[PDB]
A paper describes a structure:
To obtain a more optimal sample, the P1 gene was cloned into a vector for baculovirus-mediated expression and secretion in insect cells to generate a protein product with simpler glycosylation. In addition, a thrombin cleavage site was added to enable the removal of the flexible Foldon domain and affinity tags from the HA protein. Following affinity purification and digestion to release the tags, the majority of P1 protein product remained trimeric based on size exclusion chromatography, suggesting it retains structural integrity even in the absence of the stabilizing trimerization domain. The trimeric P1 protein produced high quality crystals that resulted in a 3.0 Å-resolution structure. Comparison with native HA sequences shows that the classical antigenic sites are surface-displayed and glycosylation modifications are present at the predicted motifs. Overall, the [name] exhibits native-like structural characteristics, confirming the structural integrity of these computationally designed proteins. It fails to protect, however, against some pre-pandemic seasonal strains such as A/Brisbane/59/2007 (Br/59/07) and Solomon Islands/3/2006 viruses (SI/3/06). Comparison of P1 to the CA/04/09 and SI/3/06 HA structures reveals these immunological patterns correlate with the similarity of the major head antigenic sites with those in P1. While analyzing the structure, we observed an unusual glycosylation site, Asn127, present in a hypervariable region of the HA protein. Although not located within the classical antigenic sites, it is in close spatial proximity with Sa. We hypothesized that glycosylation at this site in P1 could mask binding by some head-targeting antibodies.
Author numbering:
A (entry chain E): 2 to 323, 337 to 353, 361 to 495
B (entry chain C): 0 to 323, 337 to 493
C (entry chain A): 0 to 323, 336 to 494
């Protein structure tokens, strides 16, 4: 008696197909990664910059609460906390603030330098008195660390003309502000000139600012407003500041060195001494799987984000522990014989085919690189909605593609196993023409006596029908 | 002698399906996944009637155009409908700053409360409130003005400095609308407002802007050489907005307290409102369908099937309908797979329930799996762009066209692959059923090869049922030769 | 003993295809769905030559830059070509407001008519039309100015108030270009415009803007501390535009009446224009192909195959190529994919079953055509330009292009792999059914060798063998034990 059957084990893995659901299988692999360390890790051995209680504006402007960020020179990515309220301590509007955040997301490191020294640049203006109650630090009134508030000296504010040439060989980010007093008396008290103008002109940048005086609601106990501006100075370019008052002079500037793969994320996780190639706001991921469902925002080489709850693809056979049954005892291979040993050559071909199938799926799913969210102002809702449609639309398609391929391959994988096991049984039948009775349950009843060597010959494929045709019986 | 045949079901069905290998394959059973029927009427969504602007534009509705007075008493709606002939808006010529952006904000507004932010008689005692009428905005034959705006002009030959503040006590976002008038001539400026160099200042906690009137020769639009620029802002709860002006200010007479919702939008439809309720509304009509796809209109409000460009989406649920195994049995109505009976005691066309029931479950899961994968299309809102936003307009068009091309491709391709697989699935089942009979009838019966079996022995009803039930004892009929 | 065999076709084909289960499978016949060949030349579209700017950009072309005088005679084009070094634009330093948006408008413009909106000698009698030459806009060694703009300065030490209007008689959209000059110092302002405080007003029915000149110390660009800001607008048919200025106005000398078309665009190519006509144009070259996909360039003009990142897209149309069921492929059977071999007394030969082969050929042909039909033709796709304060829009546009390209490349490659595996299994099913058809006819008269061949116990002549291939083989005629 020789039988043909398939493998069975103690495996509770369940898969889904198009025709049937929750099919228990002997072997399977999970294509969805759902585990993360929950910590902010170092990227490329470079620590990320944690803003803490500060936003992007407060960090670059030099907010007094953000002085710990001043001594930072290099980072892999920028982390902002959900309660990042310290920016622009003096009320006002940051022009092109969202655009500046986009520019910094491509900045890997900058060098902070004193573009205009406070004591040397302005001898005819008062560099002191430039402190406000809104920007109070340690109980005392203070001001931005990168900006200087210039006021009248000796009751006179002479015309100011300051120029700077970019000798750093890099893009230079220059920040300045224009102050809008609440009353005409406050204008004369601070700048002596009632009608004043501010001019900032470079080779590629030209803008003039006229202070506006009006009754305004108090924000942080300040009726006045400061409008903050920025520009990028190309190497060799000259920027000229011409003002008769209300100018917030640039005390410090940044020489930018551009990189790739950086971004700005909002995370509630804590930084720990770990290194990863994939970082999410919820935690870092160390996985070679094609898909993940942790967070859509990624930094570095990461699996593609999908909304799928489960993505399990079949790599083995159906687990029927009860050919109408899988032999749990046959642990050597997927296909084999009873009276129980396993046919390695047929199993090895199936293993190679399944391994190539799994590798093809991973090949199709490319690694997702840094994808960071964008910020929009109150008059940019249409772009915000258009950006949201793009993100949701691509996520909608990829979730559909991932789930559909798994179901199709699960049905294809199971049919691959059934066809191979039938061919092995039929191969034996072609070897055994009337020498064995066809029981029909996957077993053969030999009319002759088959020793251990006799059985091995059939498995090897070199079975001689004439040799055991003499013992014709019944 | 006695004969048992094996075949499949056939009926009268003209449904045609397409596969990768062949087209227009007639099948016994099929299901349509594409919805192409709509009522052609504007229906209520969630039992809430939509706001139909009629002959009015969005600007005229919020600004209070005299022709838009029927829309003033509106507080709640499910969605906003705009007519192709909705020309009544900024009746006084001018520019509506961020008009398209304001339209986007209203698409996320489910209901607003209209209140008099500044009472006309109480707020401004030092200015003339009765002279604010223009020929362009004419109502009932007489010159009129916007119902939500107040035109302040010179009173008694004097325009004192104006300072008006409002505190948002409504606990919601407050939409404030105002205008700045730009006269045609300096004489017209002095005649309407005492001060020649005049300014308007509108300042809030998050908003600060100053407007300077410009005087120049302009072509007449609606018989008016002057221009009025309309502005808007959202006042956060508890915030204060201050209006400071020395002239040329169109004061905010009425404001709106906004309540945000989800699923709303602005659509352009020529359909008429009727007393009906629906879960899916399109500019062409409402849809009551559980199908995954529709080809009626891409613009949707509520839970809707996904829009595709497909003309037909038919998925196979049955077998091939080829009459005259060289053909299907039209007489066998009981099931998809079955046998024939020729025992001379009673002939019969019968069906194998166990094989058919297993096939039905597999096909039902296939259709349900496809529908589950295709998510319900939610509210899809069109966007408007000004003449200096063509790049944004074209980028939006690529997104809409690009996604539509892929999903139409996905819908058509998936149907074709499963249609070929379903037909191949049936051929495998009938072959397995044929081998099952052959296995039990290992030697007793002859195999003609045409799907029938020629019995060398006699097979009674008990014998026939035994083969069909699977409990056939070949020894019991093996001696008979 | 007489023998009949069943096998498949083989040839000398080294074409390799990929499936999900196995890679680099050599096949007898295949079709390439990816186009990678182009002529390498800039061709005419619909018999209409493209407009080649050469060393000029869009700004220099429309403004009338002196180096762009060959472009002044342009009336019609199919698309606009820009060279990598098109550095001649806005010779006088300044900012071109909404320059990127103006480029988008021209991408839908098929032809314009250049006309003198305001004649130089007639329009302005109270202002000096000759003093308008600068060193930055120098032609032939002497200072000159834009050919489409007129620099108006004070006449006789006086700049009277200016009011000039134009009514659109062209029945088309009219593109009007003008500039506002910003002097570096107040003395230079008075030297050109006697009035110190001046304003410029441009008002139409759909356009209203006022410009206030700004005077400040500025770095020298092309030896000029002053700046000129260039503006544009589209005048609808029948509309009137009025120019009111007291100084610092760069008057429009020439305007363009636009005739809009579809499918045009602006591309950057280093290729050379040749006397050829094509339906598909790319920056690398023209394409004459009916294939659904191409990997040449994403930028296309006209009807083009969809751009994908795939290196190869080869679909199976034939059998596995195994020269040597049956151990190998029969190179001698050239008539069809499936057929028979036979060894009788009067010779041996390879024949093909036409009825079975034609059904497979038609099925494969329908499969290939169905795939090509699903892949839609890519129409004109042109890149967009963004300024330094539009990085978010630039990045958002980049996400759309990269996101869609990833999906379509995935869709193209995945579909090929699925059908290639299905095609190979489709062929094995047909050859197995052919084997069973012969086996069924030879109930007991033949022995099953097991290698795909049948050994006849009786003598089967040429006519007898044709019956087996024909399907009309009579078992009783040769019902003989022979054992
Ligand atoms: C960095 O970021 C932190 C927040 O993360 C800022 O701290 C906030 O500062 C603002 C402004 O100073 C605070 O807002 C104010 O809250 C006051 C609450 O006072 C009550 O509660 C305190 C609790 O300690 C009691 O001691 C006190 O007696 C009161 O019972 C309000 O009274 C304030 O109103 C004032 O301003 C408004 C606006 O102008 C006026 O209209 C009012 O009339 C009044 O003058 C104001 O609302 C906020 O509470 C602070 N938060 C925290 C957690 O401390 C830092 O200031 C910021 N620093 C920098 C440099 O940016
Ligand atoms: C059409 O485009 C071509 C370039 O494709 C352009 O030719 C270029 O013109 C500029 C300006 O005339 C040249 O740049 C100058 O070159 C001289 C040396 O020959 C330098 O001395 C100049 O530097 C001085 O000026 C600067 C600006 O004030 C100062 O900052 C500096 O300190 C110096 O004082 C300046 O670099 C350039 O060399 C040519 N290039 C070529 C290849 O000819 C042409 O003018 C354009 N024509 C039109 C009508 O637009
Ligand atoms: C609301 O919209 C309607 C449009 O349906 C406005 O009516 C239109 O008003 C303009 C006013 O300039 C009319 O133009 C003029 O028509 C007369 C002939 O009646 C002609 O002599 C003039 O030279 C000029 O062309 C326009 O014809 C008219 N159209 C219709 C259909 O009535 C109405 O004024 C708008 N009301 C408000 C408050 O916005
Ligand atoms: C800048 O302005 C401040 C205003 O407070 C000056 O501070 C005062 O300076 C005068 C002159 O030395 C003293 O008499 C006052 O006692 C100072 N008061 C305070 C509170 O500082 C400051 O000196 C000015 N600096 C310059 C360089 O003029
Ligand atoms: C036109 O030629 C320019 C070079 O003058 C090409 O720009 C270079 O392309 C190579 C890759 O092909 C890059 O490595 C260089 O960085 C590019 N910039 C240079 C050399 O300045 C440009 O790609 C060509 N245009 C087309 C359409 O092929
Ligand atoms: C595009 O390719 C097609 C096919 O290769 C060309 O059409 C053939 O041209 C040759 C030479 O004139 C003729 O002998 C054939 O009869 C043509 N075949 C067909 C189907 O038209 C066509 O000329 C090419 N077009 C261009 C612009 O190069
Ligand atoms: C399944 O069997 C394996 C045999 O290697 C054993 O290690 C494992 O603990 C078993 N699992 C369960 C859940 O019984
Ligand atoms: C088709 O079948 C239905 C169901 O029995 C029947 O009502 C109808 O008359 C039939 N018509 C034809 C043309 O077969
Ligand atoms: C399939 O049938 C439809 C409906 O009659 C017809 O329009 C179409 O041309 C047919 N297709 C083929 C390939 O016969
Ligand atoms: C406004 O002015 C008109 C004259 O144009 C006058 O009849 C009217 O009484 C004035 N109203 C007020 C409140 O002064
Ligand atoms: C939608 O159609 C179904 C069809 O059976 C019907 O029962 C249901 O009442 C319909 N719903 C509405 C709101 O018309
Ligand atoms: C195969 O031989 C034929 C002989 O005509 C030749 O045309 C063809 O190019 C050859 N193919 C290969 C791949 O060698
Ligand atoms: C298939 O051939 C290509 C090209 O020679 C090669 O890069 C690839 O590794 C090959 N694949 C296998 C599985 O041999
Ligand atoms: C314009 O200015 C030039 C330069 O001084 C002078 O030669 C010419 O005569 C002037 N023309 C008029 C009409 O004033
Ligand atoms: C083969 O079949 C054809 C019909 O297709 C018939 O005309 C011919 O006589 C047959 N030949 C033989 C040898 O049976």
């Amino acid at each position: 008696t020789i039988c043909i059957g398939y493998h069975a084990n103690n495996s509770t893995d369940t898969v889904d197909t198009v025709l049937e659901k929750n099919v228990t299988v002997t072997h399977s692999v999970n294509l969805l990664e759902d585990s993360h360390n929950g910590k902010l890790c170092k990227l490329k051995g470079i620590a990320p910059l944690q803003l803490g209680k500060c936003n992007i504006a407060g960090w670059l402007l030099g907010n007094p609460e953000c002085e710990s960020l001043l001594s930072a020179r290099s980072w892999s990515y920028i982390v902002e906390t959900p309660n990042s309220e310290n920016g622009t301590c003096y009320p006002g509007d940051f022009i092109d603030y969202e655009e500046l955040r986009e520019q910094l997301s491509s900045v890997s490191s900058f060098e902070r330098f004193e573009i205009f020294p406070k004591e040397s640049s302005w001898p005819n203006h008062n560099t002191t008195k430039g402190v406000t109650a809104a920007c109070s630090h340690a109980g005392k009134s203070s001001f931005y660390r990168n900006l200087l508030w210039l006021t009248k000296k000796g009751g006179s504010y002479p015309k100011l003309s300051k120029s700077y040439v970019n000798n750093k060989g890099k893009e230079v980010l220059v920040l300045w502000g224009v102050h809008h007093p609440s009353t005409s008396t406050d204008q004369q008290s601070l700048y002596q000139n009632e009608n004043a103008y501010v001019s900032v002109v470079s080779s590629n940048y030209n803008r003039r600012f006229t202070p506006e005086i009006a009754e305004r609601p108090k924000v942080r106990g300040q009726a006045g407003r400061m409008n903050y501006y920025w520009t990028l100075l190309e190497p060799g370019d000259t920027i000229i500041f011409e003002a008769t008052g209300n100018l917030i002079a640039p005390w410090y500037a940044f020489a930018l060195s551009r990189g790739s793969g950086s971004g700005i994320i909002t995370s509630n996780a804590s930084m720990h001494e770990c290194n990863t190639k994939c970082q999410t706001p919820q935690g870092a991921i160390n996985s070679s799987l094609p898909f993940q469902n942790i967070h859509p925002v990624t930094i570095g080489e990461c699996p593609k984000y999908v909304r799928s709850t489960k993505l399990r693809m079949v790599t083995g056979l159906r687990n029927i522990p009860s050919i109408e049954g899988g032999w749990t005892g046959m642990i050597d291979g997927w296909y084999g014989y009873h009276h129980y040993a396993a046919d390695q050559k047929s199993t090895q071909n199936a293993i190679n085919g399944i391994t190539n199938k799994v590798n093809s799926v991973i090949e199709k799913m490319n690694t997702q690189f840094t994808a960071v969210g964008k910020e929009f102002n109150n008059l940019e809702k249409r772009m915000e909605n258009l950006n949201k449609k793009v993100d949701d639309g691509f996520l909608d398609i990829w979730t559909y593609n991932a789930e559909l391929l798994v179901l199709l391959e699960n049905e294809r994988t199971l049919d691959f196993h059934d066809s191979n096991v039938k061919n092995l049984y039929e191969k034996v039948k072609s070897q055994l023409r009337n020498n064995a009775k066809e029981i029909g349950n996957g077993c053969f009843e030999f009319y002759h006596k088959c020793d251990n060597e006799c059985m091995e010959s059939v498995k090897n494929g070199t079975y001689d029908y004439p040799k055991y045709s003499e013992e014709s019986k019944l």
